[PDB]
Design a protein around this ligand. Structure first.
Ligand SMILES: CCCCCCCCCCCCCCCC(=O)OC[C@H](COP(=O)(O)OCCN)OC(=O)CCCCCCCCCCCCCCC
Ligand SMILES: CCCCCCCCCCCCCCCC(=O)OC[C@H](COP(=O)(O)OCCN)OC(=O)CCCCCCCCCCCCCCC
Ligand SMILES: *[C@@H]1O[C@H](CO)[C@@H](O)[C@H](O)[C@H]1NC(C)=O
Ligand SMILES: *[C@@H]1O[C@H](CO)[C@@H](O)[C@H](O)[C@H]1NC(C)=O
Ligand SMILES: *[C@@H]1O[C@H](CO)[C@@H](O)[C@H](O)[C@H]1NC(C)=O
Ligand SMILES: *[C@@H]1O[C@H](CO)[C@@H](O)[C@H](O)[C@H]1NC(C)=O
Ligand SMILES: *[C@@H]1O[C@H](CO)[C@@H](O)[C@H](O)[C@H]1NC(C)=O
Ligand SMILES: *[C@@H]1O[C@H](CO)[C@@H](O)[C@H](O)[C@H]1NC(C)=O
Ligand SMILES: [Ca+2]
Lengths: 466, 466, 466, 466
């Protein structure tokens, strides 16, 4: 044995945990936040013009977008020279290739205009959708900025924005490597009207490479044009690490990764043979059910890691010709996915530690606390739950067309959580509705704590009657 | 049965609930918040002049109001042309008809000036009231902007503003359909003094119609002139949906509405026959008392819905002549009322779910809680209540002339709730009173939790003695 | 009883309560906050110059003060004419008399300069105090702005500012009734240096009278010059109500006041004979000890009210000659004192309500809670208390020279209360000290709830053992 | 013993406590915060130029730093003359000596550039470290601003900045005593490029002395240049008190300090003979173990105090020649250390008071409370603890490259504490990650209170079963 088996399990789990911790510490670099901070400050906070005070974070119309495209964007992208034409941003960022600008359009007459308003209005444009997307040339064709390009010819993917989800095809244009030619191209796009009443989205893409610390950065600025009017901006900066095996620490990380997958295989093989006739009722105790989540997450993480390391050479064929657009979107997407999976896996492995500390005299504490008390809350706690969702629905129906925090129903849930915690924005609620606002606020705050106190009392009495 | 009856009740209630939920989902459109957001940003955030930094949200005097009326208001209302005169705001809004501006005045000498100050002051003007309202012509009569018009001749109703409630009559002027004529009219109003020391309110009204998503928007901006001086601005951006039966989904929603009123009739008829000699003591158990609130709310909602659908054609006679002012205030008012009633009804229907989940083994949980614990708080909880209102009155008497959060006594209640939750603005309280401010704050925060803890202890002891 | 006596006490107490409520409602006017709001916005928020963006609320040096005195102050005080020289601020405020500006100085050589730094520095000026105050003429005497005037000759009293308390005497100058003469006087003061290295405070006083609602307003702007450098501003706006008996409601309130003092006499006489040989042990039960506080507060409030109504005519002799400075500071001070006393009295009267609701079957509710539970917290609660003051002292010693929230030791108490509630400003603490800041924050937040919960458990266990 | 011994201990402890309180009150001056506040307002809030709106607190590039160095820095440091060349800042500060500017550089080619990117990039510079530091002359040597100076020759020590810890040596330049010469020197530094792609830090140092209250102020301005790009400003204002024994109160404080060291010696001598064969088990009861912490802290504080008073004359040899740079960094460092030690010592002495109030009938209060309740929380509380650190690690892995609250892992702990208290910044978390952000927030807030409540219940049940 009893003692030897549990000690062996404890020591092997400790080795697995320390290996995983070394992996996470090694892969997670330090002082990376300031790189993205400087990029975002340069591209989103500088005013679009010297006389104006408008920036990218607060855009209002197509005129502002045009002022930004030929203004603050060109100033912060093409740096003159340090003491060749390679545009070292901040003097060591080395803008890679050329940027690209792409738009998405919809079809005219994709609506059902009421017959009453048939003499005053003769054009309509639906909200963005795959069925309403436009695929015809417009304006002076004369190139690729006025001709639809399919999602397969244009090596892209689907980007999920604030309003809707966008396909990834459309009308694109590759800008130039210098300031003058790019400015001329943008002026030509502005002259021959490019954004006119049919545009529903616009993307700007480029990448930089910092030599002092090996990291790439992909910038994807998105401006959405709703069917009502105005614009909605989004930036989404993201760093990358493509080149590996540069220092001895990288080979040490490779070694710890391979022994880590060895531990994963050892756990899965030692856990799959004991789901056999013996211990066949294996789906209980909440500890044996977690060891399958651990191995599933580890297997998918290993699959992503070995699928993401086989493309660092195929997609860096850009080193041969540094004149075209380097497409690095998929690499950033898989970085994000792998980081999320690794964080979830390490969180679960860390919280699995309770199963070993319970075998000491803690059983009378842990046991009782997690059995007689962590089980009867989950019985009668739906009363807090049903009234929470009822209040969320009431807030979404009353507010949500006037208050930004109450649109998009899930944000009602998040706003209610913040209100319970103490993050209150009562001015906007008061301004929106002067009667139901205060009533909703006071009734919610009163009844949540009322019912919580009630349930607490109930459980105390149940314990006293037990 | 016993089982069959409760199962029948459960299934019919579930059908009613799903019908109500689908109705609410269908009627509540998506991404409506951005329409009002763009309107409000255009009209309330742009500076009144290029050199100035003052906007509508922060107005200070009549000079600022005059600068706004011929400045940012005209710029954001008349758009030049897209590539006729119809003024497509943001290129997709189509300002309907012409805007209207109206004011309310009071009579000179409606005061009782003290005999001591009788040689230095010879004019006085009371605060706004129906008895003090002015009804005489002034200045160069020459039209309708200088002649009183009754609330019956001028189609309108009262509006409940920040300081007082305004009748809805007064001196109005219909602006023009173009920028030049409207600017000339506003300049003529400014020259021959039209706002002079007697004005107590000013309204601006107009409407727009977005064709991409069929929705109207009624805008009314109210500027109040208190007897003390200065101005107070307000806004009531509210969307509308007048044209229906445009998509098959609308007819599906109509079918849902008719089956919903069928369920309402079925519930009321099955509930009114059983309030008879059998179960005559029907005003208890808190569940039978809720089913009458449900039917009352449903009946009033149905009445409002069928009264609001018979005027979508009578009041849209504006389509014949698009040169006058389209009056849509009542439609917006009834939209607001119907939305509030529907939200309350669905909230109550959702919280009615507890009576069916209780018939399973949950009765021993819900029982004690709402029979021994949710009742004895309501007995001894007035001590938290009396001292809460005493503190509110103390804060209203001490503060409230220096702090905006403590004027208008109900705001003392709301501020106390926010202080308990954790939203504190202690700087202004410290600045207002340097002695009673901190004393009140610390004593309130101490004593609230003191008495709460005390009551908790009391109830625990009562449970232990029972 | 027994019944008749308690019913008589209840009915007379409710009569007293309703009389007090009508008195307070009548004396407290409505919509007074906007008057002071407009005054403060006009005088504290407008930039000192058109090119500059500095206002009174954020002043930095003597140059800024000089720019404000001849800039935004003169613009917002002398209004040109409405369509005589009387300067109706906002067109109905009627600046009364002329404003006055006064300064306080200290003596040169009131220090003890170290002998080491005796060759580089030859002047010193102590912080403000009565012993260090200067009383000699300076500059070109030529009038009263360069000659000391005693606190008795100059009708005034002390004002308790931010840094210290100021005597109320000094060098004063009465400005003019028009813009040109006042500007010339301020320019002459600026030319012949009047604020020079010895000034420790500066006051600006004036008053206005609104005719639409009978109210005065006294403004006392204070700018402090610390011995280190810079300035600290303060404004302290305060309304007044001098003229009474103007409407019938005023006479109704007078009748309410006289019947109120009748009730006060009745209570004091009925309470004073029963502290006799019978019920001689009258200093217990917490209810008989409160009825003496009630009568003391009522007597002092009546004394203040009858002392403040006999000077509304003596000090309004300014109506005879409207060319000099109207001194209204004492009236505002007594308004503040009377309002504070009345608010405290009504709060105590409201919380006295518990003794009558207790004689019903509520008596068993409050025995344990006010006899067994409200007493044993006050026994073992000094551990929350001693560690609270120890933490306050630690925060005052560590911070307080870098953070504004931790200077002036009582503000450490207030900041700790706000931190417990949830109002955190962690950025400043992090910037101040990188080690003791976070340690103090986390340790305080952990240990406060640790000890509180522990005490709760102790109270429970004791109740279970009792 | 019994009574006499405990009374003697109580009275001697009271004497010690009052002596310590008098010492702390005497040493801690009043209204010191405003001195540093005015300095920081003058040097960090003024815009770098009249046309620009950028200040020191928000710097972005080397151009901004150059504009600040010859702009707002020179304006706020050299004041023209009061009605000699001594530059009385704010007219009472007397800038001491001359300021000094110093930089730190790294070596070119201190990287390992990948062989793939070997044709486009030919320079690299590692992050700051002692191994990568540059020690060679550059540019036109011609003086000491272009030649490395060791830490022993350049009197100084290391400083702990935001990104890393800097050595304290480098290339320095002593500015002039007047505005013109200093401006010329800064222009010459700007012309011959002095900050160029290798600079990793820059320091600015000076000091002032206020004669009205004898206090020095050392200002150190640090600007960090990360390898990624941009700048990170950092400041430090610290008052000093070098000259003592100026008033009689100083000699009284000296007497208090000496009698305090007599009390410390008496406590240590009476405590070291009691750890003898009698009561040799001295390391229990939590009271006997704290009296050694008290004496250790007191001894180290006395050592620092007597080591810091022997250099107030050695290092003030600058009085002989007021033309060079006065180095006062070590004095400020020891002020900070002594203040921290004294605050900790007085906090511990204050919280030690519980041992004397316990000998009255309070012993039963803290029996269960401090032996049965404060002990079993520390047993089963690691579940709140392990899941707290697991959540911190998850937040650091997911966020921390996009949100500044989650970089630098300890800030994850602090942000979690603030979130629990109620200080939420949910907009940034929502913008960074749209799926794991809300999930993490809601799950953390739910599970923390879930497990806390569970443990509370466990404790209650254990108490009831014991
Ligand atoms: C307990 C067991 C459960 C385990 C938990 C599993 C957790 C992992 C689940 C992760 C789901 C992520 C879904 C992707 C969307 C997203 O997340 O992307 C969030 C970002 C936020 O961008 P933004 O805020 O800047 O908005 C404006 C940015 N333009 O939008 C995107 O760019 C969308 C990316 C597109 C993804 C679609 C993939 C299709 C292409 C295939 C290649
Ligand atoms: C538990 C059982 C109880 C059920 C609860 C039911 C609750 C529903 C009750 C709703 C009460 C609303 C009262 C109306 C005022 C209001 O609400 O309107 C609030 C709005 C907020 O205007 P604003 O914020 O824009 O400020 C500045 C706006 N200028 O002012 C109004 O325009 C007042 C509207 C006038 C109402 C009367 C009109 C009469 C004409 C008839 C046609
Ligand atoms: C859009 O389509 C309608 C369909 O009849 C047509 O009348 C209108 O001219 C079209 N508008 C444009 C801009 O092509
Ligand atoms: C194509 O021709 C149009 C006019 O015919 C012109 O506006 C446009 O700039 C041209 N594009 C290119 C790429 O030459
Ligand atoms: C009416 O006449 C007055 C002057 O007599 C003039 O100011 C005003 O503009 C005129 N109004 C119209 C509508 O002509
Ligand atoms: C007094 O005389 C001085 C110069 O002698 C002058 O500056 C000042 O303005 C005069 N004051 C008055 C009130 O005339
Ligand atoms: C940095 O060192 C590399 C090493 O070869 C050299 O090629 C390059 O010119 C150097 N750069 C500078 C600025 O000295
Ligand atoms: C040293 O000489 C260089 C040019 O040779 C010049 O730029 C620099 O200013 C000189 N420095 C001094 C201190 O004279
Ligand atoms: Ca809170």
């Amino acid at each position: 044995k009893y003692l030897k088996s549990v000690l062996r399990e404890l020591v092997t789990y400790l080795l697995f945990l320390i290996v995983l911790c070394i992996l996470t510490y090694g892969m997670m670099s330090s002082n990376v936040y300031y790189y993205t901070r400087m990029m975002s400050q340069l591209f989103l906070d500088t005013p679009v013009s010297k006389t104006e005070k408008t920036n990218f974070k607060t855009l209002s119309s197509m005129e502002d977008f045009w002022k930004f495209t030929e203004g603050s964007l060109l100033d912060g992208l093409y740096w003159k020279m340090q003491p060749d034409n390679r545009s070292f941003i901040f003097y060591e960022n080395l803008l890679l290739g050329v940027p690209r600008i792409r738009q998405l359009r919809v079809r005219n007459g994709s609506c059902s205009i009421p017959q009453d308003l048939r003499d005053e209005i003769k054009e309509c444009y639906d909200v963005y959708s795959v069925s309403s997307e436009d695929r015809a040339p417009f304006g002076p064709r004369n190139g690729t900025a006025w001709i639809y390009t399919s999602e397969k010819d244009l090596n892209g993917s689907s980007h999920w924005g604030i309003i809707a989800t966008y396909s990834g095809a459309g009308y694109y244009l590759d800008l130039s490597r210098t300031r003058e030619e790019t400015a001329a191209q943008v002026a030509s796009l502005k002259k021959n009207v490019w954004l006119d009443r049919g545009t529903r989205a616009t993307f700007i893409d480029f990448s930089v490479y910092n030599a002092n610390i090996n990291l790439f950065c992909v910038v994807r600025l998105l401006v959405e044009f709703p069917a009502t009017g105005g614009v909605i901006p989004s930036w989404q900066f993201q760093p990358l690490k493509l080149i590996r095996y540069v220092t001895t620490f990288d080979f040490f990380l490779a070694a710890c990764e391979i022994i880590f997958c060895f531990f994963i295989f050892y756990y899965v093989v030692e856990e799959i043979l004991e789901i056999r006739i013996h211990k066949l009722h294996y789906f209980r105790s909440f500890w044996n059910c977690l060891d399958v989540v651990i191995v599933v997450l580890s297997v998918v993480a290993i699959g992503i890691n070995i699928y993401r390391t086989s493309n660092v050479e195929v997609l860096l064929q850009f080193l041969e010709d540094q004149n075209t657009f380097p497409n690095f979107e998929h690499l950033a997407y898989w970085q994000i996915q792998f980081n999320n999976i690794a964080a979830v896996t390490v969180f679960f492995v860390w919280i699995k530690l309770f199963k070993f500390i319970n075998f000491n005299r803690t059983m009378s504490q842990l046991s009782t606390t997690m059995s007689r008390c962590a089980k009867d809350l989950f019985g009668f706690a739906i009363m807090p739950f049903i009234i929470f969702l009822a209040y969320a629905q009431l807030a979404y129906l009353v507010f949500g067309t006037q208050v930004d925090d109450f649109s998009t129903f899930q944000e009602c849930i998040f706003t209610q959580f913040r209100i319970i915690l103490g993050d209150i924005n009562f001015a906007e609620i008061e301004e929106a509705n002067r009667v139901l606002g205060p009533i909703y606020f006071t009734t919610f705050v009163f009844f949540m704590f009322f019912i919580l106190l009630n349930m607490f009392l109930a459980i105390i009495n149940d314990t006293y009657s037990e």
